[PDB]
Design a protein around this motif. Sequence first.
Motif, PDB file in Angstrom:
ATOM      1  N   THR A   1      41.778   1.124  22.301  1.00 23.65           N
ATOM      2  CA  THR A   1      42.492  -0.087  22.693  1.00 23.65           C
ATOM      3  C   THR A   1      42.607  -0.984  21.471  1.00 23.65           C
ATOM      4  O   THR A   1      41.584  -1.379  20.901  1.00 23.65           O
ATOM      5  N   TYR A   2      43.831  -1.298  21.061  1.00 26.60           N
ATOM      6  CA  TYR A   2      44.070  -2.118  19.878  1.00 26.60           C
ATOM      7  C   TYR A   2      43.947  -3.587  20.241  1.00 26.60           C
ATOM      8  O   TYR A   2      44.557  -4.041  21.212  1.00 26.60           O
ATOM      9  N   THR A   4      44.727  -7.400  19.041  1.00 26.85           N
ATOM     10  CA  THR A   4      45.624  -8.079  18.114  1.00 26.85           C
ATOM     11  C   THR A   4      44.972  -9.345  17.553  1.00 26.85           C
ATOM     12  O   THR A   4      43.852  -9.711  17.917  1.00 26.85           O
ATOM     13  N   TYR A   9      45.050  -7.250  24.024  1.00 30.56           N
ATOM     14  CA  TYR A   9      44.612  -5.865  24.039  1.00 30.56           C
ATOM     15  C   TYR A   9      45.796  -4.999  24.415  1.00 30.56           C
ATOM     16  O   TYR A   9      46.583  -5.366  25.296  1.00 30.56           O
ATOM     17  N   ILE A  10      45.948  -3.882  23.718  1.00 27.05           N
ATOM     18  CA  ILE A  10      47.043  -2.957  23.954  1.00 27.05           C
ATOM     19  C   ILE A  10      46.457  -1.562  24.094  1.00 27.05           C
ATOM     20  O   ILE A  10      45.679  -1.128  23.241  1.00 27.05           O
ATOM     21  N   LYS A  11      46.793  -0.873  25.183  1.00 23.88           N
ATOM     22  CA  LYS A  11      46.365   0.511  25.309  1.00 23.88           C
ATOM     23  C   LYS A  11      47.138   1.363  24.318  1.00 23.88           C
ATOM     24  O   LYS A  11      48.378   1.358  24.303  1.00 23.88           O
ATOM     25  N   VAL A  12      46.411   2.111  23.491  1.00 14.85           N
ATOM     26  CA  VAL A  12      47.091   2.981  22.541  1.00 14.85           C
ATOM     27  C   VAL A  12      47.867   4.072  23.264  1.00 14.85           C
ATOM     28  O   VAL A  12      48.976   4.431  22.844  1.00 14.85           O
ATOM     29  N   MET A  13      47.337   4.603  24.373  1.00 13.62           N
ATOM     30  CA  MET A  13      47.969   5.785  24.953  1.00 13.62           C
ATOM     31  C   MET A  13      49.080   5.382  25.914  1.00 13.62           C
ATOM     32  O   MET A  13      49.081   4.287  26.483  1.00 13.62           O
ATOM     33  N   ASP A  14      50.009   6.314  26.133  1.00 12.68           N
ATOM     34  CA  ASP A  14      51.040   6.153  27.155  1.00 12.68           C
ATOM     35  C   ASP A  14      50.651   6.790  28.484  1.00 12.68           C
ATOM     36  O   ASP A  14      50.927   6.229  29.549  1.00 12.68           O
TER      37      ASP A  14
END
Lengths: 143, 71
Positions: A1-2, A4, A9-14
């Motif tokens: 989880t990236y 910023t 928080y951004i989930k790396v996976m799709d």
Amino acid sequence: TYKTTKNEYIKVMDSVNDVGCQAYFQGLSNVQYIGGQLSGHGSPRNTSLATITQCNSFIIYGTDLEDINGFTTDGTAITADNIDTIESNYLKDISGAAIVVSSCLGFKIDSPHIFKIKTLSTIKLMNNTYNYEIGGFTPDEAL
Amino acid sequence: TDGTAITADNIDTIESNYLKDISGAAIVVSSCLGFKIDSPHIFKIKTLSTIKLMNNTYNYEIGGFTPDEAL
């Protein structure tokens, strides 16, 4: 989880079944890949090392190919224990080899050294690839 | 080489009267040892043939380029 710089928080996976490859080529013509390397060091989830679709004249001269960790397009791991099952249920799937070639005129590969191929086959040809020419690469590396 | 156009209509005539002419293809090879072509993509060829070989070209080797583009 990236995370910023604004504390988002951004989930790396799709999706939990994500797969990739090293190089993807679609809709090109007169492509030359001279030397170089395509390798999966670090065990990423790959359908192939190189996927070639709908091209005229893709030619590979002596490229180093090694170390693939095989998965189907769905995300199913390709291992020895299920190899036969794969060959029945994923014949039309664009995966299952170190080099997957679909609908390609004038495909050619000479004799590079290949090793540590943990997938079904070393080259897969499909979807009306009708004048290929395969040189003598290292035998007996796939499953 | 004279300056005669190579079309479909007259194609047969050409093959009879210009067999020894150094012309009539996309690639013309004459008196060449060790000629070699792999498989490139060829299209829009408005001439008699794709490759012509002549005058003692005796160990050529032709890979599979795109078929059926010439006349």
